[PDB]
Swiss-Prot record, chains A, B:
EC identifiers of the protein: 1.15.1.1
Name of the protein this chain belongs to: Superoxide dismutase [Cu-Zn], chloroplastic
Binding site for Cu cation: H46, H48, H63, H120
Keyword Oxidoreductase: yes
Biological-process GO terms, alphabetical: removal of superoxide radicals
Transmembrane residue ranges: none
Keywords, sorted A to Z: Antioxidant, Chloroplast, Copper, Disulfide bond, Metal-binding, Oxidoreductase, Plastid, Transit peptide, Zinc
Protein origin, superkingdom: Eukaryota
Cofactor(s) annotated in UniProt: Cu cation; Zn(2+)
Catalytic activity: 2 superoxide + 2 H(+) = H2O2 + O2
Cysteine disulfide partners in this protein: C57-C146
Top EC class, one word: oxidoreductase
Amino acid sequence: ATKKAVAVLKGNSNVEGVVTLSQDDDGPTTVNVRITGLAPGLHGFHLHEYGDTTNGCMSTGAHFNPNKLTHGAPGDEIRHAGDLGNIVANADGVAEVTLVDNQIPLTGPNSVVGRALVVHELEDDLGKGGHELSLTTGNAGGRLACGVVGLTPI
Amino acid sequence: ATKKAVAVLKGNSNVEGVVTLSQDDDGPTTVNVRITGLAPGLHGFHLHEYGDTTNGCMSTGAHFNPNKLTHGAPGDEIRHAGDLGNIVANADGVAEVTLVDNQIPLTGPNSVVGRALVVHELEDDLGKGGHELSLTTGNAGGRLACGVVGLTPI
Ligand SMILES: [Cu+2]
Ligand SMILES: [Cu+2]
Ligand SMILES: [Zn+2]
Ligand SMILES: [Zn+2]
């Protein structure tokens, strides 16, 4: 029983991309990321709470965090539901990677359909940077591009 | 049990807009529309099945139609769930209006969160135009702008 979703990422920058998501029943969610125009290196990549882009990517609110935990790495016990970690942009400015995660389902109470994905200006310090913002945003800086998670045919 | 959503409509031209949606429990959905850049006159306004904008507005698929009926006016018995009728653009190209509809909930099996709102080039003939496309699309022509229905703070 596969369900599928997609986010088209755009912003007030030259960064663009498409992210596809799929899930069987209540299993983990598979996320295929392809984003262009990125500065080579690490970029924070998160599922934010709201699929609201009225005033740009800041309208999407904070990292999706139904458990009221602090910011961490995807592999950590302590993390936000939306904490997908970093993606790596290559020398052509392309990040292309498939991630699998268990806190961003497409069905049920914590469904991320209608929320938003956001790619960030800076590396996500995973809560370990010892910076003022480490424990909330990973100090990932600005929101280069974002898109609402929408349903797509199976 | 209040729920709210929003769609930010964008497309290939200067037509753009913001549509807010709200629903208490499982009652009707109130829809506040503001769209600019329109040719003065009538424009079809529909909720399409998919929140997929990978191929511009065409990838949003057909009108949301969980009951598999033919295309109609919002007040008709025989209509698509997504059939919200026409909106009227004034001489300045602005269409601002509030609609209430009972087939576009924000929760449940027929929820429209993660689907898409689309504003059309032409008038929706409401299935009565005696046209080849009347009973599917209302012969409403091209898709000027569209946006995914995303969650927004209550
Ligand atoms: Cu983020
Ligand atoms: Cu339509
Ligand atoms: Zn976080
Ligand atoms: Zn229709």
